[PDB]
Amino acid sequence: MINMTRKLYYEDAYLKEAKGRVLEIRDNAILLDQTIFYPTGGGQPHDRGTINGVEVLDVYKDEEGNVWHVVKEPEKFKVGDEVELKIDWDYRYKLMRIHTGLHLLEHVLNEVLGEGNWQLVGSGMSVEKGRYDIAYPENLNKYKEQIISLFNKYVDEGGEVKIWWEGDRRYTQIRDFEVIPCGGTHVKDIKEIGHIKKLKRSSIGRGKQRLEMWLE
Ligand SMILES: [Zn+2]
Numbered sequence: 001m002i003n004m005t006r007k008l009y010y011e012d013a014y015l016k017e018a019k020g021r022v023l024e025i026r027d028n029a030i031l032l033d034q035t036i037f038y039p040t041g042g043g044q045p046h047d048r049g050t051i052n053g054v055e056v057l058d059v060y061k062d063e064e065g066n067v068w069h070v071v072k073e074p075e076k077f078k079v080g081d082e083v084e085l086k087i088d089w090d091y092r093y094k095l096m097r098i099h100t101g102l103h104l105l106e107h108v109l110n111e112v113l114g115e116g117n118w119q120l121v122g123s124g125m126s127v128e129k130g131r132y133d134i135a136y137p138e139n140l141n142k143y144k145e146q147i148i149s150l151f152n153k154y155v156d157e158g159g160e161v162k163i164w165w166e167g168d169r170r171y172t173q174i175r176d177f178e179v180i181p182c183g184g185t186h187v188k189d190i191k192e193i194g195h196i197k198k199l200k201r202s203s204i205g206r207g208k209q210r211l212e213m214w215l216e
Pocket of ligand 1: 043102182183
């Protein structure tokens with residue numbers, strides 16, 4: 001079935017610039033059939049950049065999961081032909097390190113707090129920091145330092161972050177750690193993440209704690 005806008009970022013291979021035919025249009029929407037521009041959802045913001053040197057402001061998906069690229073100059077595009085794609089690599093790559101960071105934080109937390117003794121409740125990330133909302137009885141702070149040293153240690157050692165599909169479902173995994181059902185864009189190796197720049201703990205309420213992490 002090709003009625004689904006083929007995606008390239010899932011195959012990323014870190015490809016920065018892309019080129020693919022063009023499909024229908026809306027007010028600002030620009031349905032396509034090729035793209036390196038990651039839509040949204042899963043806590044990983046829509047990376048950005050330029051499509052034909054044009055300004056991309058929003059990038060999401062439709063019910064059938066069709067990537068629409070909300071641009072600034074919609075009055076410079078037809079309705080069928082072909083175009084070039086350019087994405088803010090850095091803003092992208094610095095998101096992968098972050099997103100891949102969170103998965104590692106998941107394992108690390110398992111090791112330190114004990115797999116089972118805590119519950120992930122919320123997630124998501126900004127362009128600079130990442131957030132992991134959790135539900136754990138003890139005031140996390142008493143683990144700040146043990147967590148960071150462990151996060152980093154794994155980093156240095158590095159490890160392959162393999163990814164795959166099992167039909168219409170995509171799974172990911174770091175080394176021999178947790179196998180996660182995430183749907184974002186990850187680095188190929190965690191050594192490509194970097195040590196923690198800062199790990200702030202805060203109480204979000206209802207007894208839920210929030211780990212915000214920053215990378216060097
Ligand atoms: Zn995730």
